[PDB]
Design a protein around this ligand. Sequence first.
Ligand code: MG
Ligand code: MG
Ligand code: MG
Ligand code: MG
Ligand code: MG
Ligand code: MG
Ligand code: MG
Ligand code: MG
Ligand code: MG
Ligand code: MG
Ligand code: MG
Ligand code: MG
Ligand code: MG
Ligand code: MG
Ligand code: MG
Ligand code: MG
Ligand code: MG
Ligand code: MG
Ligand code: MG
Ligand code: MG
Ligand code: MG
Ligand code: MG
Ligand code: MG
Ligand code: MG
Ligand code: MG
Ligand code: MG
Ligand code: MG
Ligand code: MG
Ligand code: MG
Ligand code: MG
Ligand code: MG
Ligand code: MG
Ligand code: MG
Ligand code: MG
Ligand code: MG
Ligand code: MG
Ligand code: MG
Ligand code: MG
Ligand code: MG
Ligand code: MG
Ligand code: MG
Ligand code: MG
Ligand code: MG
Ligand code: MG
Ligand code: MG
Ligand code: MG
Ligand code: MG
Ligand code: MG
Ligand code: MG
Ligand code: MG
Ligand code: MG
Ligand code: MG
Ligand code: MG
Ligand code: MG
Ligand code: MG
Ligand code: MG
Ligand code: MG
Ligand code: MG
Ligand code: MG
Ligand code: MG
Ligand code: MG
Ligand code: MG
Ligand code: MG
Ligand code: MG
Ligand code: MG
Ligand code: MG
Ligand code: MG
Ligand code: MG
Ligand code: MG
Ligand code: MG
Ligand code: MG
Ligand code: MG
Ligand code: MG
Ligand code: MG
Ligand code: MG
Ligand code: MG
Ligand code: MG
Ligand code: MG
Ligand code: MG
Ligand code: MG
Ligand code: MG
Ligand code: MG
Ligand code: MG
Ligand code: MG
Ligand code: MG
Ligand code: MG
Ligand code: MG
Ligand code: MG
Ligand code: MG
Ligand code: MG
Ligand code: MG
Ligand code: MG
Ligand code: MG
Ligand code: MG
Ligand code: MG
Ligand code: MG
Ligand code: MG
Ligand code: MG
Ligand code: MG
Ligand code: MG
Ligand code: MG
Ligand code: MG
Ligand code: MG
Ligand code: MG
Ligand code: MG
Ligand code: MG
Ligand code: MG
Ligand code: MG
Ligand code: MG
Ligand code: MG
Ligand code: MG
Ligand code: MG
Ligand code: MG
Ligand code: MG
Ligand code: MG
Ligand code: MG
Ligand code: MG
Ligand code: MG
Ligand code: MG
Ligand code: MG
Ligand code: MG
Ligand code: MG
Ligand code: MG
Ligand code: MG
Ligand code: MG
Ligand code: MG
Lengths: 272, 44
Amino acid sequence: AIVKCKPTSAGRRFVVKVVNQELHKGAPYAPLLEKKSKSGGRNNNGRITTRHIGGGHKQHYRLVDFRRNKDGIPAIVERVEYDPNRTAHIALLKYADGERRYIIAPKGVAAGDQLISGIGAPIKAGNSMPLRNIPVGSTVHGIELKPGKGAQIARSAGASAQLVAREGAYVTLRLRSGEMRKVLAECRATLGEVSNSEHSLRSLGKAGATRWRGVRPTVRGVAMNPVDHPHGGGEGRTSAGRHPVSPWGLQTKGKKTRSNKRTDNMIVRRRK
Amino acid sequence: MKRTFQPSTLKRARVHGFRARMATKNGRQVLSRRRAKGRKRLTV
RNA sequence: CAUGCUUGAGGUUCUAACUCUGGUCCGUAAUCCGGAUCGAGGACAGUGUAUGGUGGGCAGUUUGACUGGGGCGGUCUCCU
RNA sequence: CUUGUCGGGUAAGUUCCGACCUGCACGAAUGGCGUAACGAUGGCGGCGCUGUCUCCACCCGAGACUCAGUGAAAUUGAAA
RNA sequence: GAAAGACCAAGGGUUCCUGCGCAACGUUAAUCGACGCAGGGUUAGUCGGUUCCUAAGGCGAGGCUGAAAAGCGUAGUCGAUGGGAAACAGGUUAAUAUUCCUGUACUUCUGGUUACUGCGAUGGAGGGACGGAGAAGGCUAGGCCAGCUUGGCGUUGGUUGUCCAAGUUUAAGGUGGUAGGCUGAAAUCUUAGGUAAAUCCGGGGUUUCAAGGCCGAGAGCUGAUGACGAGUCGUCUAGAUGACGAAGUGGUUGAUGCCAUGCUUCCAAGAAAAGCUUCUAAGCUUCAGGUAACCAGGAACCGUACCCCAAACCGACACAGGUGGUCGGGUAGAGAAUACCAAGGCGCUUGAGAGAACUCGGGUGAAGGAACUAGGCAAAAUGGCACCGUAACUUCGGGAGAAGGUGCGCCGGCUAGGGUGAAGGAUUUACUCCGUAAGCUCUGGCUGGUCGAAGAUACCAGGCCGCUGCGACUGUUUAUUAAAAACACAGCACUCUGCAAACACGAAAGUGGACGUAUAGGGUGUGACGCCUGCCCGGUGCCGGAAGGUUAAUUGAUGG
RNA sequence: AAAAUG
RNA sequence: GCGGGGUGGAGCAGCCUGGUAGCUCGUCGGGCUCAUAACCCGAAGGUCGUCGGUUCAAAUCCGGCCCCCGCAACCA
RNA sequence: UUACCACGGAGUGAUUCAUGACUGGGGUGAAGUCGUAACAAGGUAGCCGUAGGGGAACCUGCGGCUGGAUC
Ligand SMILES: [Mg+2]
Ligand SMILES: [Mg+2]
Ligand SMILES: [Mg+2]
Ligand SMILES: [Mg+2]
Ligand SMILES: [Mg+2]
Ligand SMILES: [Mg+2]
Ligand SMILES: [Mg+2]
Ligand SMILES: [Mg+2]
Ligand SMILES: [Mg+2]
Ligand SMILES: [Mg+2]
Ligand SMILES: [Mg+2]
Ligand SMILES: [Mg+2]
Ligand SMILES: [Mg+2]
Ligand SMILES: [Mg+2]
Ligand SMILES: [Mg+2]
Ligand SMILES: [Mg+2]
Ligand SMILES: [Mg+2]
Ligand SMILES: [Mg+2]
Ligand SMILES: [Mg+2]
Ligand SMILES: [Mg+2]
Ligand SMILES: [Mg+2]
Ligand SMILES: [Mg+2]
Ligand SMILES: [Mg+2]
Ligand SMILES: [Mg+2]
Ligand SMILES: [Mg+2]
Ligand SMILES: [Mg+2]
Ligand SMILES: [Mg+2]
Ligand SMILES: [Mg+2]
Ligand SMILES: [Mg+2]
Ligand SMILES: [Mg+2]
Ligand SMILES: [Mg+2]
Ligand SMILES: [Mg+2]
Ligand SMILES: [Mg+2]
Ligand SMILES: [Mg+2]
Ligand SMILES: [Mg+2]
Ligand SMILES: [Mg+2]
Ligand SMILES: [Mg+2]
Ligand SMILES: [Mg+2]
Ligand SMILES: [Mg+2]
Ligand SMILES: [Mg+2]
Ligand SMILES: [Mg+2]
Ligand SMILES: [Mg+2]
Ligand SMILES: [Mg+2]
Ligand SMILES: [Mg+2]
Ligand SMILES: [Mg+2]
Ligand SMILES: [Mg+2]
Ligand SMILES: [Mg+2]
Ligand SMILES: [Mg+2]
Ligand SMILES: [Mg+2]
Ligand SMILES: [Mg+2]
Ligand SMILES: [Mg+2]
Ligand SMILES: [Mg+2]
Ligand SMILES: [Mg+2]
Ligand SMILES: [Mg+2]
Ligand SMILES: [Mg+2]
Ligand SMILES: [Mg+2]
Ligand SMILES: [Mg+2]
Ligand SMILES: [Mg+2]
Ligand SMILES: [Mg+2]
Ligand SMILES: [Mg+2]
Ligand SMILES: [Mg+2]
Ligand SMILES: [Mg+2]
Ligand SMILES: [Mg+2]
Ligand SMILES: [Mg+2]
Ligand SMILES: [Mg+2]
Ligand SMILES: [Mg+2]
Ligand SMILES: [Mg+2]
Ligand SMILES: [Mg+2]
Ligand SMILES: [Mg+2]
Ligand SMILES: [Mg+2]
Ligand SMILES: [Mg+2]
Ligand SMILES: [Mg+2]
Ligand SMILES: [Mg+2]
Ligand SMILES: [Mg+2]
Ligand SMILES: [Mg+2]
Ligand SMILES: [Mg+2]
Ligand SMILES: [Mg+2]
Ligand SMILES: [Mg+2]
Ligand SMILES: [Mg+2]
Ligand SMILES: [Mg+2]
Ligand SMILES: [Mg+2]
Ligand SMILES: [Mg+2]
Ligand SMILES: [Mg+2]
Ligand SMILES: [Mg+2]
Ligand SMILES: [Mg+2]
Ligand SMILES: [Mg+2]
Ligand SMILES: [Mg+2]
Ligand SMILES: [Mg+2]
Ligand SMILES: [Mg+2]
Ligand SMILES: [Mg+2]
Ligand SMILES: [Mg+2]
Ligand SMILES: [Mg+2]
Ligand SMILES: [Mg+2]
Ligand SMILES: [Mg+2]
Ligand SMILES: [Mg+2]
Ligand SMILES: [Mg+2]
Ligand SMILES: [Mg+2]
Ligand SMILES: [Mg+2]
Ligand SMILES: [Mg+2]
Ligand SMILES: [Mg+2]
Ligand SMILES: [Mg+2]
Ligand SMILES: [Mg+2]
Ligand SMILES: [Mg+2]
Ligand SMILES: [Mg+2]
Ligand SMILES: [Mg+2]
Ligand SMILES: [Mg+2]
Ligand SMILES: [Mg+2]
Ligand SMILES: [Mg+2]
Ligand SMILES: [Mg+2]
Ligand SMILES: [Mg+2]
Ligand SMILES: [Mg+2]
Ligand SMILES: [Mg+2]
Ligand SMILES: [Mg+2]
Ligand SMILES: [Mg+2]
Ligand SMILES: [Mg+2]
Ligand SMILES: [Mg+2]
Ligand SMILES: [Mg+2]
Ligand SMILES: [Mg+2]
Ligand SMILES: [Mg+2]
Ligand SMILES: [Mg+2]
Ligand SMILES: [Mg+2]
Ligand SMILES: [Mg+2]
Ligand SMILES: [Mg+2]
Ligand SMILES: [Mg+2]
Ligand SMILES: [Mg+2]
Ligand SMILES: [Mg+2]
């Protein structure tokens, strides 16, 4: 539930908090955690390759099962947790033979639920099974692109895709972006959408809440000198006297940058 | 006022030391160029 | 006008070249790298070479003289 | 142009506040018009307080002054 | 005197102590010295390293890539600022001491003998193992007071006494399992799991019980008839030497230190690996190995002097500068502020005069009170606690300590409580529950008296108010003339990107983005909030279209 | 289909 | 200092390239209407700012003058 | 000498009158200017609520009413 904060301070006036009272408030499952360090946006040459990255809080990595290849054994949701490195929540499952695993929590799984997988599973939410025998018109999430590779699409909060068509050994499904893309019918998906649908109804409230997530301030190119940006220079405030452009000379107000040409045959319709 | 030289012997041996010049061929020519001048120090 | 012999252009398909930052087996005690085998794409992508376009992202430079200081203006060759 | 004109404040106000519209040459995300809280931010006005001032006077320490010791500097064509 | 005292780390390297010196060094002299000469001085199983383990990162057999040099990276092995065994009190030198000596401990290893025995990993499980803030307790160091012992009887009125001075100390360890924290326990059958196996862990079933199991400061008892202790006696040259050596106790207060890696709560969701416990695999199997008791021995190597908020380190100097962490007493005080002191340390390496102008740092000022000036710059003024009271406006939080006002010292009378706490009582008969007079300590209330010019009496300790421009606010910025209206910001919008993502660094391999997946990632402009954001696609960009016109390498008909 | 006023 | 203009009552073509002044509104006269407006038909109306010059011929070329409108007037 | 207390002072609010540059509409007045919104089916049937636009009456969208003409 979203909670609006009282204007007790100048930095609490516009804070809208997403608070869920049903998340687990103990400790995460230790056997499925490993360390991860920050990079600052620097590659192995030590140079900044992606800017406005740095700082934040220490985090652990949670081994989330994106494959979901225990076909047949029924599971049971044991708790829904917080993940520092998603925007969705995660569900800890206990199978009929120990073997606890993390998955991405669907929209309405709390403490029971079976969440079986494989061919022949029911059509309830949270069940995983190949795209071939998912009824046409239903919504899916966590779609994988290569068999055995793991889920790639529809993974953030409240995300979903819809199965539109099916013919041959391919299925066509409409992505959250508005794009029609054909996917192999051998690949797997999960029914329903992703939890934490209200993630978008939040307000950070202050400059310090951006830094808690590891994001550094963004200077705008007009506030620079000609040596630093194509937009910089001029006496007084100027409006970037040329057509708006990237720091490295690429136009950004409308120019298309896709140049794949290998996977064009899997794009039925563009997003735009 | 803080001055530029703040001494430390661990950071002195790891940057200018003998085993740091012999790691790369560019530092192995500093040593040869100093053995030819006739230097007595030859390494930090 | 079917034909037989060739080549130009396009579409469709197949696998056997190439591709895989997909699975499992071995080297092996190893999310590298090789080999084997499944799976997908497939003569496409990609790279070499030749070529048209774009390209201040980057570079080497030029941007005249007279002048009651320089600039602005005017003048710069020939005839009475 | 310009200290535009009118009103307020002051004994007297090229600054300040409220208006007019003749906008040399405002104007709507190089955002337009307002706005509580905030500011070692710009302008103006009050109360208290005062050596800021009329106009300076006395007093207390450290130099300056004399004695003993050590002992520089910039500069310099030559100087009756 | 929250250092200008004491101690660690870095850094320095003989500056440490003694004997002999004054040429030079020391901003003066020097008999002195961090100066010259010559000797001396640093003692470890437990302190710090090394050996064991890893983080960021480095190197990197093969490998991939690259004109050459070389780049990246797998296995691996280096890398603390972190993890992981164990010692304290007293004495002692001119110079060392948790090291030497005395006394009392603790950890670990080796070789034997006996007795019983399934041993075995690099692999599996457990454990190590952890955030911000807050709060209620328990305790300890430390501090005070009383009593006790020893000495004193005061150059000037009184001082044989509810008088004055000093001391009233004692660790590690062992025993103890307390305040308190966490957890259900045992037996039996079984298994889509932990890459193979497992009696270990995870999962499932049945039976029984309300009691076990792990942590945990601290008190007390002992260590300790011992050490220490004012001082006294003997011996010697004013100081050394040996022996003896009094009291050594209770009550209150109480930490920012320990219980506490605990408990509650909130999002920003809070290191790894080894040491450690346990299970089996390959191998032995009557050797090996393991488990207990006893006996005998061992713990190697390196650093230990001195400065260390500075005259010894970084600044050319014996330089108003800079330098990480620990301790930190008394009286006032909320306080680690401030004032006066303790322990301890110092008076800052030129002086002596005299008392001109002028300069620097201050004190007081008649009448006036900003008339000064670019401008109230500077100065003056306000300043604490309790109580009363307080405007426009507002995003309902605020503005607000708005503004303004009253009381405050000391000495008595009466009076209401809290905390600790003998005797007593109870049964959980003992590290226990309830509760108590005296004493000690902490909060008040109403009622007088009294001194001064003035009682928050010194140090310390907000000046306030009314209109406006700008930027919403906290924050950042030109090290060394600009701290702002500039940058950032939360919020808004446009646009690109379907994952081997766009994009960026790399002749390339590769890496970041991201172990993320359109509620996500990059670029661009604007900049909380409220009301809004109007017309123009002619120019230049971008997006889409494919008909026609032009149009490169290439090909080579024809002609000469 | 156009059709204002006095 | 440089540049562009002055044409019926009003606002705009004609000036390039010398020989022919045009468009809309307005004005006048007659129509339709009970009357005005709107609408229809027919006419008038500018020797081209002024002077001077070349030319057979100047709104048109070349000069001065009087009127306007734009820029520029900078470094100390 | 203390207690009560009038005059008089200090700070800060509320309320009510007079006035104020400049501005918003209202009413009245004459042979003024622009159009013609309503009254007939007033020549696009009018009114009500609401929103946007425009020299002005007013126009347009959404819903409602008949207090609408012809058959
Ligand atoms: Mg960014
Ligand atoms: Mg993240
Ligand atoms: Mg920005
Ligand atoms: Mg931004
Ligand atoms: Mg930007
Ligand atoms: Mg700027
Ligand atoms: Mg700038
Ligand atoms: Mg740069
Ligand atoms: Mg540029
Ligand atoms: Mg400007
Ligand atoms: Mg600029
Ligand atoms: Mg510009
Ligand atoms: Mg370095
Ligand atoms: Mg050197
Ligand atoms: Mg095939
Ligand atoms: Mg990748
Ligand atoms: Mg491979
Ligand atoms: Mg190809
Ligand atoms: Mg090609
Ligand atoms: Mg190519
Ligand atoms: Mg250039
Ligand atoms: Mg060019
Ligand atoms: Mg360039
Ligand atoms: Mg050159
Ligand atoms: Mg040049
Ligand atoms: Mg140049
Ligand atoms: Mg040239
Ligand atoms: Mg010149
Ligand atoms: Mg000139
Ligand atoms: Mg001149
Ligand atoms: Mg001259
Ligand atoms: Mg010129
Ligand atoms: Mg002016
Ligand atoms: Mg005025
Ligand atoms: Mg007046
Ligand atoms: Mg003034
Ligand atoms: Mg706009
Ligand atoms: Mg601007
Ligand atoms: Mg502007
Ligand atoms: Mg704005
Ligand atoms: Mg704009
Ligand atoms: Mg703005
Ligand atoms: Mg504004
Ligand atoms: Mg600030
Ligand atoms: Mg202000
Ligand atoms: Mg004034
Ligand atoms: Mg004096
Ligand atoms: Mg002298
Ligand atoms: Mg050292
Ligand atoms: Mg020496
Ligand atoms: Mg000495
Ligand atoms: Mg001596
Ligand atoms: Mg001498
Ligand atoms: Mg001397
Ligand atoms: Mg010496
Ligand atoms: Mg190690
Ligand atoms: Mg490493
Ligand atoms: Mg390497
Ligand atoms: Mg190699
Ligand atoms: Mg190691
Ligand atoms: Mg090591
Ligand atoms: Mg360490
Ligand atoms: Mg010493
Ligand atoms: Mg000993
Ligand atoms: Mg074993
Ligand atoms: Mg392990
Ligand atoms: Mg730790
Ligand atoms: Mg916590
Ligand atoms: Mg904490
Ligand atoms: Mg005590
Ligand atoms: Mg006595
Ligand atoms: Mg006496
Ligand atoms: Mg006496
Ligand atoms: Mg004891
Ligand atoms: Mg003990
Ligand atoms: Mg207990
Ligand atoms: Mg030592
Ligand atoms: Mg020492
Ligand atoms: Mg010290
Ligand atoms: Mg000190
Ligand atoms: Mg020094
Ligand atoms: Mg000195
Ligand atoms: Mg010093
Ligand atoms: Mg103190
Ligand atoms: Mg102090
Ligand atoms: Mg003392
Ligand atoms: Mg001195
Ligand atoms: Mg003197
Ligand atoms: Mg003075
Ligand atoms: Mg004074
Ligand atoms: Mg006086
Ligand atoms: Mg005075
Ligand atoms: Mg006076
Ligand atoms: Mg006064
Ligand atoms: Mg004045
Ligand atoms: Mg004056
Ligand atoms: Mg001041
Ligand atoms: Mg002052
Ligand atoms: Mg007050
Ligand atoms: Mg105020
Ligand atoms: Mg009196
Ligand atoms: Mg202050
Ligand atoms: Mg202003
Ligand atoms: Mg600001
Ligand atoms: Mg702050
Ligand atoms: Mg900074
Ligand atoms: Mg500066
Ligand atoms: Mg500032
Ligand atoms: Mg800035
Ligand atoms: Mg975005
Ligand atoms: Mg801006
Ligand atoms: Mg266009
Ligand atoms: Mg167009
Ligand atoms: Mg196109
Ligand atoms: Mg009319
Ligand atoms: Mg007529
Ligand atoms: Mg200038
Ligand atoms: Mg109407
Ligand atoms: Mg009408
Ligand atoms: Mg009508
Ligand atoms: Mg009509
Ligand atoms: Mg109404
Ligand atoms: Mg309209
Ligand atoms: Mg309407
Ligand atoms: Mg209607
Ligand atoms: Mg109705």
